[PDB]
Structures are given as structure tokens and as C-alpha cells.
Design a protein around this nucleic acid. Sequence first.
DNA 1: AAAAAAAAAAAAAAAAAAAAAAAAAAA
DNA 2: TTTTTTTTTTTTTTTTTTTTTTTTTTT
Lengths: 468, 467, 474, 467, 84
Amino acid sequence: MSRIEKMSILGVRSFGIEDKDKQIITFFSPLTILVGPNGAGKTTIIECLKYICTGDFPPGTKGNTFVHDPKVAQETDVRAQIRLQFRDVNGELIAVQRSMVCTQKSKKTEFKTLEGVITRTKHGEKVSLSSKCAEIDREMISSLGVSKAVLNNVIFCHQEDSNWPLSEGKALKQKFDEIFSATRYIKALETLRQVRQTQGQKVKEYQMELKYLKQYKEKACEIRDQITSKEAQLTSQKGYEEEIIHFKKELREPQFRDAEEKYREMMIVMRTTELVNKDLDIYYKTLDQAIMKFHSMKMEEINKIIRDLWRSTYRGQDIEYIEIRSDADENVSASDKRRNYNYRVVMLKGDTALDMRGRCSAGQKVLASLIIRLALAETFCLNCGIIALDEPTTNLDRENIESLAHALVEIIKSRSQQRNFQLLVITHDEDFVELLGRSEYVEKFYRIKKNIDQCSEIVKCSVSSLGF
Amino acid sequence: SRIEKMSILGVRSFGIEDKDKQIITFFSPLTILVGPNGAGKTTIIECLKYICTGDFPPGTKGNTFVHDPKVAQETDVRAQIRLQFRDVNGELIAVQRSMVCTQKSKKTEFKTLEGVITREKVSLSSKCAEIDREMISSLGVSKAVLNNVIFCHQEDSNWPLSEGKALKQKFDEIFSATRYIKALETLRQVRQTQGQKVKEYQMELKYLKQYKEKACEIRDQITSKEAQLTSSQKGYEEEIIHFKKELREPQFRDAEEKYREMMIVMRTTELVNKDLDIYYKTLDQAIMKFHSMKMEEINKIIRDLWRSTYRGQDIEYIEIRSDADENVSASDKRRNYNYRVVMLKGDTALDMRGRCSAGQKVLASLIIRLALAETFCLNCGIIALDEPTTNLDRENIESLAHALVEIIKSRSQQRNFQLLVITHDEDFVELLGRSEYVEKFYRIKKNIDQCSEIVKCSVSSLGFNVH
Amino acid sequence: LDDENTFKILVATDIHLGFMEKDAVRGNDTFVTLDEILRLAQENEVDFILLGGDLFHENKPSRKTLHTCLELLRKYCMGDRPVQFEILSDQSVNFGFSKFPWVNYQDGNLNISIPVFSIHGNNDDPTGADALCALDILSCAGFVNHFGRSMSVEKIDISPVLLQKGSTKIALYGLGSIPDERLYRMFVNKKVTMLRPKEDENSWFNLFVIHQNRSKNFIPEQFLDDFIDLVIWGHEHECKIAPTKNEQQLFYISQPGSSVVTSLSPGEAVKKHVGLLRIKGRKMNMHKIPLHTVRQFFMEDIVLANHPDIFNPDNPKVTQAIQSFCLEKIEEMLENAERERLGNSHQPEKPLVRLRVDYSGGFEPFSVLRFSQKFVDRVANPKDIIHFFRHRTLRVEDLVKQYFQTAEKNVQLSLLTERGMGEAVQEFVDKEEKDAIEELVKYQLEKTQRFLKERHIDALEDKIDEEVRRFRET
Amino acid sequence: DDENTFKILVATDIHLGFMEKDAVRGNDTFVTLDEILRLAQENEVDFILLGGDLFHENKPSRKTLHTCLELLRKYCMGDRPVQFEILSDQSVNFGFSKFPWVNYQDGNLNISIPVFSIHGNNDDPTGADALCALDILSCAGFVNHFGRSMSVEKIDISPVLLQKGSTKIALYGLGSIPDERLYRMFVNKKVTMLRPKEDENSWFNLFVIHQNRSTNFIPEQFLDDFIDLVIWGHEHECKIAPTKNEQQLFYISQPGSSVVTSLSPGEAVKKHVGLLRIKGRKMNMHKIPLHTVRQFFMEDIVLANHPDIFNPDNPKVTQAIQSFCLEKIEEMLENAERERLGNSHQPEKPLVRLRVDYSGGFEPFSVLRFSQKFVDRVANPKDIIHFFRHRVEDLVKQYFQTAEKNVQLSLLTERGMGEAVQEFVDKEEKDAIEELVKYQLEKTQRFLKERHIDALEDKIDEEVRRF
Amino acid sequence: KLLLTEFRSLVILKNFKKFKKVTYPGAGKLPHIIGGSDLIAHHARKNTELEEWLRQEMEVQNQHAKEESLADDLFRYNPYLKRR
DNA sequence: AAAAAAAAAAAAAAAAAAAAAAAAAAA
DNA sequence: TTTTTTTTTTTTTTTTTTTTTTTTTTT
Ligand SMILES: Nc1ncnc2c1ncn2[C@@H]1O[C@H](COP(=O)(O)OP(=O)(O)O)[C@@H](O)[C@H]1O
Ligand code: BEF
Ligand SMILES: [Mg+2]
Ligand SMILES: [Mg+2]
Ligand SMILES: [Mn+2]
């Protein structure tokens, strides 16, 4: 039970900076349609939602780019704020805010977040807590009931960041161990790898120095032998004594007085470091195997979800089903320069399993990513039934568009009962909208446009008695 | 230059047996490809690109391109692609590049066999490089243009909005100056190798200097003790032979000359490293200046096309700007590239990449491709638009249709122009001169065995496969 | 018996024209069934046709759909047969949305044999600033009398389409397809109103046509007013053309159903019927008329968990048993459909077969891709034959600890002790020391190096690792 | 006139629904059609002869169809008598309908002014059933769609024979075929016109054709001389006054559009609908100006032909150009105000377009800022001003020479690295660079060691300076 | 530069329109129009159970509006601690 | 004329360095 | 409060490793 109620965008990308340009958008249930021209600001709303929820900017965008550019504004600095109002899992009303500043300095530009505010209503009164962008995450991550990884990837997936299930092995593995909440074990594994490389470099340097220390050791031993022989000769001759004194002085140089001790110590340290390296390799292999077993065991019931979703949705007698499958590398070691990640979405073309990456179409990739996101939303976003589809009908033909509309209608029916499901749809296709709205869920939709000053504006429109 | 026929066999979902050889005939000036998702529309453009330049689709290594030997339940899948077309002069040429994907153990071997060139009807076996150059010469455009402007993949279609290094590689392959960047890489690698050698040699230098100092101390002792012996006692004779043994030792025998030679090499490599740094900086500046000079001309085309096509009032116009790094050097670990498509919101210029919308990005990519086709595709008037209206809104779809119709009208004045479109939009096909140009379109579907077929359909059944 | 005081009304509902018009098998089903409906209206000499809504499947019907609808309406609903009933109602408030606010048969330039009175369904509800629907186009052409459309969002006041043939009198109340939650809000805010004739109110039939969801939000059937005598109900495709009266509502509820199979619901397998209504003063007699052009739809539901006799979850060859059972069920359904196809020649040869298999006791669905390949040219829904569905802990720490203990006992650690690196990794994960692994490695290295130095061991690898093993064992 | 006079209102390109979603520009074609129907009703015309393109879109929206239906019902239906006959076989003239008769001959339709129309290319029949919007209109019963092409292979034109009293009219018609196809049919002698064998010379023939006039040209030579008045379409320049070419014995009428669809300089002339009066073989065409058609003023300016105010390399010419454009658009916005008096039906906001052509090197100003000034004065603020226009080796050599003459070369000889890179580029020698670097060190190092240098850090540098 | 012209037999106050308005009972007579004033908003007797359901859902609506008012005033809250 | 062993080029994808903001002292 | 140094994330360029191609060198 968590719903995003209303937003306030100011100074974000193409939105205006004066307080008279503060745009407010109220999300309806169970369907919210956003329409507008290219560059109007539809995707900026989801970007603001993601930034409020988790504090991460859109992909490829740093702080300098997310906020309005001071140069276009003809202003020294620009201060942006985003205000979100929502209910946490228990239904209590919470409003959060995040401030922002971009200062135009010389050629580059500087970015900085001001302290944000957490506001609730306790005992009929109003409270405010200025927080530092790290309590306005943890706290509202706990309030929303879902983790940062799912909020970034499943629910508020950016339009550019979509089709992330069909990404490289390491990227997919990273997405799925942030989703599975096991990032710290991979951190420990990489710490093991790094310490192994450090100890290996130390071993190489120790061998290099050991060569010279062996040379020194043998030369000093020969000097000592000649000293003892000369003393034996003398004790049984002033020049003999002078030679003896000179050889003692040759024993007196720092690289000869301390000769045996350094060689012994360096031998012990290199051998112990080598044994530690072997044991570290063993432990790293074991931990990697355990992590890839856990991954496969938690993708067991999502693959099981993904299969049914793909069989219901995809209109084609081509792929039986698709599933995510991972496979650990048998011949892996902590000393390897490049690791191998077998984390791929697999297509079941007949009775044989292929790899979807580089082998599917654009529409198939879009549908597979949508199905994977919906399965992950079913598995993890149980307490926060929100999903934002940014042009889900991209590269989808007529039959798949209709089937996706039917599947989304079924999801709405199955999740709106005793729970709140908010499907935010930003589309340019009126047919998809009509297909979803045939169940009569849409009464008002938001049309994002721009004024004469080219600042984004959000205005609520009506399907009936008003334009569409 | 125009393309007439294509024959696809054993590529992706196309069938392996000789009964599944699909044939597609390209019309002029507009050819429409329609069909369900995962049917073979984009595979046709992929086959065209592969037969033109030999390059596989992005992300494909050649073993995911041929029909999986497993789904065929075979141990080998022989794949053939043919393309009958006309070169710039107007002669008929057909190339028949082939390949196999042998299946062994858990891996999947791949290799390409010798294709042929037909010209009266003279067919000769040829290697991949020779057919590549021959078809590049016949079509009249460079391989980079063929890969990026004409037959770019549906995924590699927003390449002008890519990172600085990738955009620079695309544009210096487009401008035909890749050998100079190859020379830049050679210079950087030479400087890095010499720097590493200098580091190791200076590590050895101190040791060598210490050995030399010990040798000099031994020699001074030899001289003093020899003078003492000449002045005159037995021990003054014993220490002499021991000192001669010490000087006899190779570590202290020729330490001076070795240390001198190593220092000479050291200083020499230092000044050579400095010189190579200056030369690398100069050549980088020259390359960036050449890029700016050769790209300012197409900036005007990009500006005018954006002003005509883009219906919004956000961006006045877009262009592309390259700025050389002032403080560049061959010893730098990481270089910074400043290739960027730039949008001008009013009077200030901004970085379009990461700061634009999806529709703005796709429209900008389309404008860049059309400008590069105006500049370089004069000889080969073909452009394949794989779902051009992917993210465009209604007004921009209409404006793009109008611009494409104007391009068709203008560029058909003396040479054939083809605008192969893959789409799921009925309205776009309509507005793209549906009555004027398209009479027969192509439907790509799949039979009961899930092998792609290419069938010619009259325009009466156009709406059955598009929405 | 049809006197001069009888109201023969052909009550159709949810024709759903243009549904799957792009299909090669089911393209012309809806048009043919509408042709049959109009033929029944023409043959029965009905006074007027009363469509219950959803006459079109799409909000904006295609050109073929509109052209076919106009062709059929001109062929059957236009003629020189005189109209037998009056209209004593203010025609500028019932049909007064168009610039021709009068019933179509009364236009001085149109000769209408069978008037058509219809409401708009939610698949063809008005949209846009002008608030137009497909029925608006039909009424502007002059073939249909679109009535009952709401004008104001805040409140709705419906005006009866008063009709009188001889002695009998009908008040034809009609409501459009308002969104279900919005109409619910109107019904609970008392923002709905039914205007009854002011005098003789007890001498009208008060026939009400409504297109909304029922017991299926849902507009319950008790919110409706108690003066009604019949309620035609659309947005419900399971035919119930037979009028049904609940315990206390004082009105009858008729559910004509649909003219085509839109969804594959269990309630959609009922035989489709079109009504033949008769009114004589106050009494009603609805006679059902089967449609012989409606494609058959047979379905079966099987739950594999509730058949332990044959379906054994642990059977390694149970998937082939599932496939064989499904094949036998589909064959039986097809044979049953064929046995019923010899009664009439008008039903389409290919039927609609659906088989929902519920696997929940750890069963694996078979190849639905190839199972449906055995009925490519024998069923009308080749892609949708079998539906597989399921009706609606693990901690990484235990797994990594188990793996660590298993590894320690299957290989021999050389320097670090047992159960030390496991707890170091656990500390790094939980307490976030971010230095536990390095600290442990350095501590063990320095300890063993100090022991080796103070033990006075000569510099040779074999003795070094022998004393290392001795320290590890101790 | 009298009982033996045919009165025909010829409006050709209504283009209903054009810019319907537009705010200012919407609801214009509907009002113009209302005016046309009002003129038809007032003049008591026998029938209306539309020339095709009655709808802008191939599938008109609901608003367009509803408005057309309501206007046709209001004006073309009533109790007024019909005074002419249909002597032709109604099954062939209007037979692609389940009702193959004329609409006023139907026993259930009262038609005062029957409408005879052809289909344009903007609303040509599409789909499996080959239906157009005029098919929907004819099914409703308000329009007599005639002249549809049944066979793709050949064209047979059968006229809708008319007769009012003594006068006889043969009403040939032909919907818009794709222009290249139709041209190929005409060349292949596959177009035929079937004339009555009774009273061959007593019929006044008139052809209603909706095609291009200026392969896509279908000129006037491709029409026989037996006809006498060819009404035309797909041409919006209002030439409603008939013309007779010396080579062509048949008149040509071009009523033109009832709205400004494109901003071409062929829609700036006033639009008229023609009141025609045949009386035997005597025709009298009288134009009637449209008082509700939005005004269109436009001028073409070429900046390269004014070498007196527009200096090509003037640093502040970009403001003189803007001033000239501002003064121009202002005389037109005023010539519009001065010309709008009296015509109360004229829309307040006119259409102003300026085409600016530059080739001397002018830089277009901010078209957004210029269009921000006239926003509530022109009906098309977005489209006010149009702006349009009708090497490595040497550069690297120059840059290397500049670098050599700029900074002090340490050890590499002058013009060494440049030749090395040039050899690497053309000869593709990959070792052309390393070889030179190594060969310079090896040489100068030798030179240094022969002189047994003292290896002092700065003394070796002086030795290299000697080089 | 011409067209094929071939001849066939196509021929197969005063009026030629075929239309007679088939009279409807009440055509041309006094229009006894019923509407406007004589259209009253009738009621629904007692219907306690129906009254109970309507009142309960009205209370639900009132509670929802109460929550919505709290939402609105929470959003309009100016951030006092916005100095940072 | 054919095999095969080895060296070179490509590229997909993991690795890493520079930039910038956040956090943590730190006065 | 502000300064200054250290951490962490991102992102965009770099490096690696396997595969294919090609070269050569033999049979
Ligand atoms: N920092 C910025 N300053 C000004 N305008 C910006 C800035 N960043 C992005 N924009 C512009 O603001 C708009 C953002 O709209 P967006 O949400 O991406 O579009 P859409 O809703 O069509 O997907 C685009 O026109 C973009 O170029
Ligand atoms: F699936 Be395809 F790219 F439309
Ligand atoms: Mg977007
Ligand atoms: Mg594709
Ligand atoms: Mn035209």
C-alpha cells in the first residue's frame, strides 16, 4: 500500500525557474496517461520521480545536466526543487523535498544539492526535518517498501536505461545482485581479488629483491670465510694483519653486516605470502561459487514467473518461453585479469536454448524487457505497486501491442483488488491508450506542452468534452 | 547505383534447405517492409549490410548471425546471401557471399567461404577482402558510409548521439582519415613503450652507479697500495693480488663504461620522448582541425534540415563541434575527446547528448544521417530507415514524412533513389506518398516450420500488418 | 398473437462490429451476425430495433466497419413500410445533440421502415472536444436514433423516449456507458435522476436500457429505481436473454449478451440469443431467438493437482501424459462440436476451443508451441488453444557459510586457519569494517613471519612450509 | 436562366478536416464547405460537381465525417424537385455499391441537389474492400460516387448521362490513379472513353479528372478533343476561368482548392467556386469568390540579388536582414488589414510566408525570436520565415612544418617524423615510425659513445645540441 | 498524343425523383409534445437497505475527501527549514 | 594442390582512470 | 560557519581474451 500522489517540478531541465512556473502533476489510479510533443517534459517527470525516490540522475546525466542550464536561463545560478507527496507502506502521509543548485563558473559548471526536507503529520501537527540526501534515501526507501535497486530498474526505468535485461553479462549480474540485495558479498569477493593481486605484486618484488640479497649473502659468506682463514694463518705479518683489518672493514659495510638476517626474513615473507595467495585463491573461488548458486536459486521462481508471462503475452509461435539463467565459471581464479560472466537471458527456440542477446529483434527485446520488469515487479514490488512504462509500445507490432494491452489490463485487475496499482504510461500511441481505457479507467490525462518562453508546463485535460 | 534483388538463405530465422530461399525485389523510389515482431524485416537490412561491407550486425560475432546449427538440429548450417544490383556506371553485378556455422562440442565454430562476382555472366571465386573492395567501388560509397548512414542497424541508429571517442571513430572513418589516427596510436604506443623502458633503466641506474663507485674505491686502493709497495711488506704484496681479483670481478671491471652507456641512452630517450610528445600534440591538432574544416560544410545541411523538420520551438538548430584538447600529451593515461552534437536553445550552445529527449535524439540522428547522405551518398542514392518513427510524436512524424517526400522528389531528378522503410505505422506509410509511390509492398512472416518468408502483397492488404 | 396494440421489439445488444476484422478466419463474423439480426427484425415485422450498446468494437470504427453497418441499415431499416407507433416526447432533448433533433423516421426526406433506438457502449463512447461517437455518425446519416447520452459530468438527467402504439405506452429510458467508478459516484451522490411523465405515470412500461458492468467496479442492480419494468443489460457477453427477477427489485433484468465471442471467458460459451420483445399495455413476453451464424465456443478447465490418480508430480514421463490427456480432451471437444454442426449449415466450420490447464503441484507445462501445431486448420484460434497458469526462506549468508565449510574440508588451507576467513567476510558484510579481510591476512602473515624468524629456521622453501604446516596444525 | 439550362456548382478540392486539431486554423474547411453549399442552394443549381479530395485524410476523422454528413443533409436534401434524367445504366456508373442507383432515384431519399463527385488521391480507395470516404458518403445516400477504376490493367470510362430538356450532358469521370501508373496506362493505350452510339454529336461532354498538371505531369495532350470542358483537380492555383490551348479543342477548368493546404506561391490568389451554365453545347462559366477562405500573402526574397543593402561580409548584416524581413511581414500584415474590411466573413489572422534564399554567405537569424513577435497577428506563427539554399596530407604537412619552425627540435631531424608518418599512411608500413625513432637514438647514442662523453647530465645535452 | 474513343449503347415543373413520404400517424396534426414542465423527478419509496448502502459509500467518500484535504494541505506546506 | 601450425586483426566486454560531488574532518 | 582532504560513484576510454582470418611453411 504505497501511492505517489502529486509532484512539484521547478528548474529541472526545461521547466521554468520562477516560482510562477512551478508545475504540479497529480497521479491518478490505476492508470495515468502522459502525452505531449517531443521534448515536452513527459520523461522529465519520471526522472524527477526517480531522483526523489533514490537520488540517482538519468543515465548519461550528471548533476550539471539534470538541472536547468544557467546559460540558457541567462542567470548566474539556478536553484531547483522537487516536492513529492505520497503514502508509505502503512498509509501514513509523507511529503519529501530535494533542493538543488547549479552555478555557472568560468567555462565549466558546478553542481551541489542543498539539504532536503522530510515532512509528516503526527498527532494532527506538521513536522519538518532537514536531511542530507542520505537520510532522504534510506528513510524514504524504507517508507516506499522497496529497495533502491528495484526502484531504479524495475519501477522507474529510464527510457534510455530500458532493455537493461538484454545487457552484457557483468551489467546484468550487477543489476541482479543489487536487486537480490547481495552487493556486499560481491564487495567482499572483489576485496579478496584486490588483496590477492596486491600480495602477488609484493611476491614479485620480493623475488626481485631476493636475487640481490642472495648475491649479497654469498659474497658476505665468502668474505667471512676469508676472514677466518686469514685469522687462522696469522695466529699461527704486519701486512697480514692489515689485510685482516681490511677484510673486517669489508664485512663492516651495511649490506654485509646485515646479510643473513635480511635474506632469511625475505625468504620467510615471500613463502608465507605465496601460501596466503594460494589459500586466497581457494577462498575466492568458493565465495564466487556460493554467490552464483544463490543467484541461480533466487532466479528459480522469477524464471518461473517469466515463463508464464511470456507465454501469455508474446503472440508468436517462435519462442516457447524465455528465462534468465546464470552459470559459474569453473576455471576462475583471483589472479585472472579479466573474469567471465555467464549471465544471459535465454530464448527457448524449440527444444534448444539460445542466447537472446544479439539474436533477438527490437520488438522481441522490448517485449522481453517488459516481461522481465513485470515479473520482477510481481516478485519484489509487492508493497509498492507502481511501474512506469515509458513508451512500452516501442518497436511492437499490432498483435504484440494488443496482447501487451491485454496483459496490462489483467495486471491492473489482479493488483487493484485490496491493493493500489499505479501504472504510469507515457505514450504517443492513441490505440494503446484506447485499448487500456476500454475498461474505463481514464477520465483525465496530462498533456505536457510549452509556453512562449519555452518552459515546460503540465495541464490536465479531459477525454470527454475536451481534446485528446 | 541501385539494388534490385536479394536472396537470403540460412541467415537468422531464414530456412536452411534450398526450398526456403527467399527472394526480395526492391522497388523505387519507396519500398515498404511490414510483418510481425521477430519476422525478418531487420534481417533483410542486416543481410544487405553484410553483403555490402562484410560487417556483421552490432553485437554479433558471426556465430549468432548464421541460422543456429542446433535449432536446425543439424551439425552444420550453410548460409548464402545474394544481391543483384547495378553499379554507378549501370552494369549488373551479383555477389554471393557464403558462410557456415559448424557445431562442435559445446562451442560453435564459424567461418566464411569464398563468394563470387558475376558480371557476360562471368562468375569468379573471390576472397572477403576482394569482394569488399569490389562492392565498395561498385556502389560508389565508402564502407563507413555504408555501415553508418545507409544500412545502419536498428540498435546502432543513434550513433551521432554516442560518446566522444565513438563519434570521433565514426566520423574519421566517414571522412576517410583513419590511417592518421592509426599513426597517432602508433606514436602513443611508441612513447609509452619508451617511457616504460626508461623507468626500468633508471631503476637499474642507481645499482650501476653504486657498482661504479665501488669499482672506483677499489681502484684508488690499488693505486695507493701499489705506490706504497713501490716505495718499499709481504702483506702489501698480498693485498695487491686480492685487489686485482676485486677489479677482475665483472661487476667492478667495466662498471664505468656500462653506466656511461646507460646514461647516454637515458638522456637520448628522454629528448626523444619529449620530441615525440610535441609531434603527437601537433598531429592531434592537425586531425582535429581537419575534422572541423570538413565538418563545417555539413553543419549547414544539418542546420537547415533541423530547422525545416523539427516542429518544436526548443532548439533553434543543431550542429556538431569538435575541440582539440589544449593540454594533450602522448604520456597521458586517458585522453579526452570533445566530439559532440550541439543544440542551440536560443543564443547559448549546449551538449545535446544526455540533455535531449528520445524523440529529439532519434530526429537528430535522422537529420545527421540525411545530411551525411546528402554529402557522401550522391553516387549511391539508397537509405534504409529501420522504423524511422520509433519515438517521434505526431507532428514530428508528419514533418519527417514531408521532409522524406521532399527528398524523394528532389533526389529523383537524375538518379534513382530508394527509401527502404521498415515500419509498423499505417499513418506514416500513408503520409509518405502512399497513393503516389507505393503500389506493392512486402510482408515478412513465418510459416509452420518457423522459417521466414518474403511474399509480395498488393497495397490493398497493407493495413493487415501495420497499426 | 400480434394485435394492433403490441410492441414487437428486437432487443439486440453488443453486436461488436469490426471485431477481429483483420483475421482471415473471423474477419466477417460480426457483419454476418448483424446481417442475421437485421434479417430477423425484418422477418418478424418488429416495430423498432433496440440496440443495447457496443454496436462497434473500436472507439473509431474502420472504414469497412462503418460502410458495412451503413449498408445493412440502409438495406433493412429503410423502406416504405409505415411506422405504427407515435413519439409524444420532446425530440429536441432526447436526440437533440445533432443539428437534426427529430427521430429519423419523421425526417421529411427519409423513409424509415424499422426505426433504430440505441445507446453507446464503452467501446464506442463519445470522445473529443465535440463529444462524438460512431452512433453520432449513424444518426447524422439518418439510420439510428442515438438516445440517452449524458451531457453534464456533474449530474445526469435522462429523458424518456416516450412511445405509444395504440393503447400501449412505453417510456424508453436510456443511459450511456459512463465510466464504472464515475457512474458509481453519481449513484451514491444522488446525482442521477429519472424523469417520469408527470401524469398517468402508472400507465407506461418504463423500459430502461443500460450498458454497464453487473455483479462483475460493478454497478449493483439495486441502485436502479423501482418503477422500471424491464432492464436490458449490456457490457455482459454471457447471454441471459431470459428475463430474471431477484428477490426484491420489482423489475425484470434481461441480458441479451453478445453477437460474437470477444473474450474466452467460461461464461462466454453459452449459446448466443437475440430477443423478440412483446408489450401489450403492461405485460411482457420475451421470446429468445437463436443465432445460427455465431461461431461455437467450447472450453474445458482442468486442475492437474486435483487428479492424483493419473497425474503423478514425481513421474519423470508425466509431461507426455499431460500432452496425451490434453490431446484427448481437445479431440473430444472437436468431435462434440462437429456433432452439433450438422443441425445447421450456417455455423462456421472451425470452432473456438480453449483448454485452461492449471499446474500447481510442481508440474512442467509441455510444448504449447508444438501442441497447437496439430490444429492449424481445424480450429479458429490456432495460437490460443492451451492456457497454462498457476493460481495465486533463502538467505545468502547460510549458503556462503555452507560453501566455506565444505571447501575447508575438501582442500587443505596452507596459512589461514579454519573458520577465520568466513567470519572475516561475515564481519565485512554485516558490520562494514571494509578492512576485515586485509587486517586478517596481514595479522596472520605477520604472526607466522614472526614465529618463523624467532624459530631460527634456515632459508629453504621445504623447511619453511613444513614449519608453516606445523604452525597451522598447532 | 430557363427550363433548358444546366446550373452546376464546381468546387473541387474542399480538403475537409485539414488542420482540424489546430486552434486558429481549425474549423475553416467546414465553414468554406458551408459557404459552397449555401451558394449551391441560393443559385438553385441542378447538381454539385465535386472534383475530388473532398477529405484531406485517407481515413477522415469522426469530426470531419460528422460535419460533412450534417452539411450534406442540411443543404443537399429537401423537397425541391429534380429536373434532369439519368439515361445511362445506373449499374455501371454507380455500381460498386450494394445500391447501384442514383441517390435521388432511391425510394427512401429526398435529394434537392444531387452531388456527383470523384475520389482524389488524398482519399482514394484503400483496403481489402477498396473503400474510400466517398463510399461512406454514397452509402449514407448524399453523394453519387462515380468514375471509380475497377480493373488495374485497363481504364474504361462510362459517363453518367444527363438530360435537362433539350440539352444533353455526358458526365465522364475518373478518380485519382497513381500518376506514374496512370501515365503508363495512357502510353500503353489502355484508357478508353465509351460514348453513346445514339445522338453522337448531341451530347456535351465534360471530364472531371483529379490529377497533376505541372511522368507525374499527365499533360493536356493526353486527353481527346471530343470533350469540351475538362474540370481538373490536384491543382490548388485557382484558374477557374476556362482556357483553350490552341492545340487542344477542349476547354480546361481548374477550380482549385477551397483552403490553403500548402504555403507554395500558388495559393496566394483568391479562391472561387464556379457557377457553370451549359445550354446545348454552349457553356458560360461564372466565378464566385469565396469570402471565408483565409488570406495568403507571400513574397520570395533572394539576398544574393541585392548588392546594395545586403553586404555579404558585413559584420552587422544579420540585423539589416532581420529589419528588412520585419518591415516586409509588416506591410503584408497591414495589406491584410486594409483588404479585410467589408468581408466580415474573412478570418482575422492571415497567412504570411517569406522565403529567404542566401548563397553569398549570410547567416540566418533566430527564426524563433522573429516568429515570437508576430504570434497573434499571423495564423501560422511556427512557419513565418523559410531559410534555404539552392586535405589530410597537406594539412598535416603544414602543421608539422609549423611545429618544426615553432618549437626547438631536441634530437629528431627536421622533416623526419613527417616523412615517417607519410610513409606509414600510404605505404601502410606499420614500422615506418618505430624504425625512425630507433634509428635516430642508435645513431646519436653511437655518436655520443665514440666521444666517450663524461655522461654528466647537462654535458650530454650539450653533445646532443651539437648533433 | 490522343485517346481511344469507342462507341457503345449506354442509354437504358417535371420531376424525376422517386420519393413519397410514407405518412406516420400524427403527421400534420397538432403536435401533442410532452416534455419540460411535465417531467418530474420521481422517488424510490423507502429502500432502507439501499439507503444503508448509499449512506455507507457516502461515508466512505467523505473519509476519502478528508484524506485528500490532508494531502492537499501537506503539499501546499511551505518548507520552513529550506534555508539549506 | 592441400594441412596445419602460427602470427595478426576485430571486437565484445570487463577494467580502470579522471572528474565531480558527498562526506568527514578541522579548525 | 568555512576549508581541506578523503571516499565513492559514474562514465567514458583502455585493456584483454577468444575467435576468425591470414600467412607461412611444409607435404
Ligand atoms: N539542463 C537543461 N536545460 C534546459 N533544457 C534542458 C536541459 N536538459 C534537458 N533540456 C531539454 O528539456 C527537454 C526534456 O524533455 P524530456 O522529458 O526529455 O522529453 P520527452 O518527454 O519528450 O521524452 C528536452 O527538450 C531537453 O533537450
Ligand atoms: F521486432 Be521488430 F524490430 F519490429
Ligand atoms: Mg521520453
Ligand atoms: Mg527490427
Ligand atoms: Mn489532390
